[PDB]
Amino acid sequence: LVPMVIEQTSRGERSFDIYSRLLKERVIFLTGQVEDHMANLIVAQMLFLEAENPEKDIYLYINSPGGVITAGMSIYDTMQFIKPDVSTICMGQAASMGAFLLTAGAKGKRFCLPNSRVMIHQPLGGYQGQATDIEIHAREILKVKGRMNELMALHTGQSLEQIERDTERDRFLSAPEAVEYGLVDSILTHRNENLYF
Amino acid sequence: LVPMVIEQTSRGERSFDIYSRLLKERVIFLTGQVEDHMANLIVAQMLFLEAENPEKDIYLYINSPGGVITAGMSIYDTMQFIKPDVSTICMGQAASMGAFLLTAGAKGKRFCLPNSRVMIHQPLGGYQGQATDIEIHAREILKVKGRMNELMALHTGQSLEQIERDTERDRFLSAPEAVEYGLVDSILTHR
Amino acid sequence: YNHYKRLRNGDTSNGVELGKSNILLIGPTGSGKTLLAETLARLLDVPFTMADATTLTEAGYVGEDVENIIQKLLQKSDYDVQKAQRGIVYIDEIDKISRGEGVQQALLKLIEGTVAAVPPQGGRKHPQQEFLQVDTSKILFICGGAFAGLDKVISHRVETGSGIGFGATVKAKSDKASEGELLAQVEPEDLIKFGLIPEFIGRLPVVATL
Amino acid sequence: SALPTPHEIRNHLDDYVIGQEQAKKVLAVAVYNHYKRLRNGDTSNGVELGKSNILLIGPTGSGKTLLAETLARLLDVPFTMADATTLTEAGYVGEDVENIIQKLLQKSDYDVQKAQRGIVYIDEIDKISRKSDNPSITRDVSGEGVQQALLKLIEGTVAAVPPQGGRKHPQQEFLQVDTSKILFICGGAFAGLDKVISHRVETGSGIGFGATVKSEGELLAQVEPEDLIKFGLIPEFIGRLPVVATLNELSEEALIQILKEPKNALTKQYQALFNLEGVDLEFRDEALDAIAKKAMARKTGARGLRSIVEAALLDTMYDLPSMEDVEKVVIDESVIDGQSEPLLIYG
Amino acid sequence: LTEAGYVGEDVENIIQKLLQKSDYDVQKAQRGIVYIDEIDKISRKSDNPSITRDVS
Amino acid sequence: RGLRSIVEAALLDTMYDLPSMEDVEKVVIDESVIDGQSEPLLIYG
Amino acid sequence: SHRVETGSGIGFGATVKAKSDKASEGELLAQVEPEDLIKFGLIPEFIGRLPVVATL
Numbered sequence A: 001l002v003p004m005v006i007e008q009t010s011r012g013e014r015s016f017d018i019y020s021r022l023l024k025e026r027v028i029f030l031t032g033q034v035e036d037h038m039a040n041l042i043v044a045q046m047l048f049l050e051a052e053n054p055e056k057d058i059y060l061y062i063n064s065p066g067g068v069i070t071a072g073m074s075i076y077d078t079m080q081f082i083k084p085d086v087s088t089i090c091m092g093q094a095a096s097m098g099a100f101l102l103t104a105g106a107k108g109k110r111f112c113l114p115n116s117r118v119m120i121h122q123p124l125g126g127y128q129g130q131a132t133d134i135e136i137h138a139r140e141i142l143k144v145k146g147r148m149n150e151l152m153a154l155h156t157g158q159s160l161e162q163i164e165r166d167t168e169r170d171r172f173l174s175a176p177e178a179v180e181y182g183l184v185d186s187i188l189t190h191r192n193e194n195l196y197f
Numbered sequence B: 001l002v003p004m005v006i007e008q009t010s011r012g013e014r015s016f017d018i019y020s021r022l023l024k025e026r027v028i029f030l031t032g033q034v035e036d037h038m039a040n041l042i043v044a045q046m047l048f049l050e051a052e053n054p055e056k057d058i059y060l061y062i063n064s065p066g067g068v069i070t071a072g073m074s075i076y077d078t079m080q081f082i083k084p085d086v087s088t089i090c091m092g093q094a095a096s097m098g099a100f101l102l103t104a105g106a107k108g109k110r111f112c113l114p115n116s117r118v119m120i121h122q123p124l125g126g127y128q129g130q131a132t133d134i135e136i137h138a139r140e141i142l143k144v145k146g147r148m149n150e151l152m153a154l155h156t157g158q159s160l161e162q163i164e165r166d167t168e169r170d171r172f173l174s175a176p177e178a179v180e181y182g183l184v185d186s187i188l189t190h191r
Numbered sequence C: 001y002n003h004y005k006r007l008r009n010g011d012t013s014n015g016v017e018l019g020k021s022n023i024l025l026i027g028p029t030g031s032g033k034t035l036l037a038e039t040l041a042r043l044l045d046v047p048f049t050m051a052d053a054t055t056l057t058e059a060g061y062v063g064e065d066v067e068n069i070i071q072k073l074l075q076k077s078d079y080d081v082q083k084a085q086r087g088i089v090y091i092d093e094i095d096k097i098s099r100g101e102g103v104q105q106a107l108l109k110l111i112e113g114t115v116a117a118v119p120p121q122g123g124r125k126h127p128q129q130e131f132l133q134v135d136t137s138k139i140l141f142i143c144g145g146a147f148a149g150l151d152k153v154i155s156h157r158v159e160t161g162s163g164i165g166f167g168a169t170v171k172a173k174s175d176k177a178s179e180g181e182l183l184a185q186v187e188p189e190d191l192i193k194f195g196l197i198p199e200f201i202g203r204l205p206v207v208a209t210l
Numbered sequence D: 001s002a003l004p005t006p007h008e009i010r011n012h013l014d015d016y017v018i019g020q021e022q023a024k025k026v027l028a029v030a031v032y033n034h035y036k037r038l039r040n041g042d043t044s045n046g047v048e049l050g051k052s053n054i055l056l057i058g059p060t061g062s063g064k065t066l067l068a069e070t071l072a073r074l075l076d077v078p079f080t081m082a083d084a085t086t087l088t089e090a091g092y093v094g095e096d097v098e099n100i101i102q103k104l105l106q107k108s109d110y111d112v113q114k115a116q117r118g119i120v121y122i123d124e125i126d127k128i129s130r131k132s133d134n135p136s137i138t139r140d141v142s143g144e145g146v147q148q149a150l151l152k153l154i155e156g157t158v159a160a161v162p163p164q165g166g167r168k169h170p171q172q173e174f175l176q177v178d179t180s181k182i183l184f185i186c187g188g189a190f191a192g193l194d195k196v197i198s199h200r201v202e203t204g205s206g207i208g209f210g211a212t213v214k215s216e217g218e219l220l221a222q223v224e225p226e227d228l229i230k231f232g233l234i235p236e237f238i239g240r241l242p243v244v245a246t247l248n249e250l251s252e253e254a255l256i257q258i259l260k261e262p263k264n265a266l267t268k269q270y271q272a273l274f275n276l277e278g279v280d281l282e283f284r285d286e287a288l289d290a291i292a293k294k295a296m297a298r299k300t301g302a303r304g305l306r307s308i309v310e311a312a313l314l315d316t317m318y319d320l321p322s323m324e325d326v327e328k329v330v331i332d333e334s335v336i337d338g339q340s341e342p343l344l345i346y347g
Numbered sequence E: 001l002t003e004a005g006y007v008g009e010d011v012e013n014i015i016q017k018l019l020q021k022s023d024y025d026v027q028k029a030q031r032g033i034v035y036i037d038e039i040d041k042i043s044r045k046s047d048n049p050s051i052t053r054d055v056s
Numbered sequence F: 001r002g003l004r005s006i007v008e009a010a011l012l013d014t015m016y017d018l019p020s021m022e023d024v025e026k027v028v029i030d031e032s033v034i035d036g037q038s039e040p041l042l043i044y045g
Numbered sequence G: 001s002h003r004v005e006t007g008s009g010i011g012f013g014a015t016v017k018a019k020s021d022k023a024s025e026g027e028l029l030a031q032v033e034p035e036d037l038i039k040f041g042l043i044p045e046f047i048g049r050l051p052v053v054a055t056l
């Protein structure tokens, strides 16, 4: 159950949902596993916000343990496509896809909370069938891993070799560790002493 | 089912849900296990209330047996991030995550009912796989446990060593006990 | 004192026109609103009339209804335009009309100041020109009424935006001491939420709270 | 008997109005042309001059009603001020559109020939606009029903006016008044029009990938008729009102000027009150800035100013008449806040 | 105009204006011309049942 | 009726300052005046 | 009736009121106040001139 809120407009009072009311303020939430449906929803919201105001920055809060990759690439491509700077924020955690989307935000507009924890690891997959099909699917996931590592290095500014060594196994990072690694630009400890917005 | 409630405004009678009516009065509820979706909802409510009037205090009612830690930390970080003082109240019970959020409220604005029951314990986890990943995940939960204890000690004002000794196993506390532990500022016995 | 001091010096030779300031009386029922206006009229030998906004809420031919007020004053004034222009008008239940925007619009035109045509000494039929022309700009208008909901509005603004939670201060024993101090803090913003029109509030700068 | 030029008229308006240059130019030009069209009543030539009606648009407390009042001071011809909220469709008990001319006659001492040459200001015209239309199959009395009635009045037609404070009826005691030469100035604080203008200016194409992505006074200065049609005005009504004048909102600096620069400024009014009482009143510059912030914070505009001053000097005005040997009163910024009392100089 | 009994006006008024132009010479008015403007303002709102009578 | 609005706007400024002006015998309105790029050309004689 | 009647409740403890308890004009005109007369159509000042109210 989502609480409904009232907004006092010029015409009169209007009822809105809590998630829709925040959207009106250019705020999107990426919670739960990344799938095609939720990703499609986020894509629709980004496009709607861009058309509404293409200058103002879009805030995206991320609290998810990761999920499908393809769905994440759609969200990532949409962010790099639109003109607005998509300010990504990390709440709770950000796994591989969450972290890739977190670092994919606009330069200088990526934030993390003091007690957040980012996690990065290589893609996961599998296939069952003949050896020929197995080799095909293997090459594809490998190409995906290469593409994902290249993008992570581009946003973080680190060397591809360093990323490959750190993505071979589950690597956890706190807010300070992320800042020095290039995943995030700054930390948001409070609202009335940073005023980054 | 959620009963509707009529609010008498200047001219237009407005129908509200029982939970939305309270939200209009800066009152949030944290019931059931702490997951990512419910936590996201609580965060949205906090942000919405902050935008409307950032100088008015917010109230968060807590009746939950706990849950995931990442979700609880997101709620905690949001409370410490916004300007409004988040007054936490404990109704029924407050487990590890509930208690961490309870004690995390604004100083002097943390309350608990007389018959409430608080519970604190170390984090829980597990992993299945190779030894390398196991060692990595073990350090992470250990770092979280240390970080949680620091925050618990910072809000309660107790010694980190004492908190660690009390969190090695399930520790139950009544409303009076919590008051002397620094978890809760005062008890609301009557009006 | 100020309103009549201006009438004492109508010319006031200078490049300055003295604008009228009307009064808004807020308070509960039977608290002495009408008595204050009546007592002033006894002290100052001027005609005093009383009107009720609720009767005027119909919003049909408001010009005639508002003009009638002036006609009532003339009868008490003995059909003296000079004496009538110095009169005191008290309007009651001004809160009820709020939500009747058209009623407020008609009223503020009368409060701001306008020329009204009143038939002289009754009569079966009389020509248009014969009608007496009185100006309401020089007449002091007092608007009263009890604003019960307004108290809660002030608390929602001045105090914490609460009233339903545990911490919420709802220790209400009908003392009314809290309500009196809260109404003292009344500002135009509070009246706007109650349903009044900003134009009307601006013509009632003086706010007295019983 | 040379007529006053627009420069003279604008100078007179500046004495009482601050911050509306375009509206002042339009009104001055309209009034000047009005006098010229009336002077050549005979107009011996193959030409009949046609009036151009005005349309004022501006937020509340901008100076619309005030501009109308200022004209009345410097207008030889009869000027009347009317409100459109009362007006209703003929056959309904609310009000009729002929009452306007009735008020105009009162200002002219019931001299028809002197009223036809008059000016009429109609306030709250936006209220008539169909904002939340919700089609009116039953009826539309307060809105579209009033616009339809005004059309001929503005355009010019003989109007049956009751003698005084009467309604239309079979009675034949009606005198005909012609509004062909009467000038109309319809002023309304259109709310939400800026959103309509922004939509047209920032319509864009769509929302997807393939789609293309694109001040109140400055925004309102781009107003076109189509913007008003969508707001609820019939195309016919705008045609009757060719001219359009926009009024920008009052800034904090403007409020400070309003306190002292005008001829009937708030500060000057109180100084006169004290001066006739034998006391001198001085307002410090800091106080005026403080008052403006209070009004701006309360969103009360220029109207609020009278309340701020009345409250500040309430205690002083109460004890001043009884007070003796008091020659000057000084107001400081603290006095407006209420922390301190105004300083008094004893002589 | 109105529906013969309401406050607005009567239709016969038109003829009155006509007589004024002819100096109340009936025989000179009966052969006159009349122009009724804004005739679209008097029309049912695309409603055949006519729930309520439209006096205007 | 739209024409009256256009002509009024183009000549609004000129009408305001024409009486103050002296020695002006002719006013010329070009196509640019309607667009707003240029101002009416005044002839002094 | 509207002024002095708040209706009835719905629970067990609530006092249900039947038609016989309608409290008609008999015994209901004594509670009358000047505000009720004004709604009926009288003038406020007119009532003040008549303080005595004899009810039958």
Ligand SMILES: Nc1ncnc2c1ncn2[C@@H]1O[C@H](COP(=O)(O)OP(=O)(O)OP(O)(O)=S)[C@@H](O)[C@H]1O
Binding pocket: C199, D016, D017, D018, D019, D020, D059, D060, D061, D062, D063, D064, D065, D066, D067, D123, D188, D189, D250, D258, D262, D302, D303
């Ligand atoms: N430009 C101005 N110069 C001087 N005083 C002003 C100005 N604008 C507003 N005021 C003051 O504000 C008061 C109210 O302004 P008005 O113009 O009467 O309001 P408005 O323009 O009629 O808006 P409406 O009619 O309420 S929609 C005036 O009596 C002045 O004292």
Ligand SMILES: Nc1ncnc2c1ncn2[C@@H]1O[C@H](COP(=O)(O)OP(=O)(O)O)[C@@H](O)[C@H]1O
Binding pocket: C028, C029, C030, C031, C032, C033, C034, C035, C092
């Ligand atoms: N302070 C007072 N002193 C003396 N009489 C009072 C006072 N307040 C109210 N009254 C009495 O109440 C009546 C007027 O009440 P009023 O204030 O007009 O009610 P309302 O404000 O609802 O119109 C008078 O008959 C008067 O005797």
Ligand SMILES: [Mg+2]
Binding pocket: D064, D065, D123, D124, D187, D188, D189
């Ligand atoms: Mg106006």
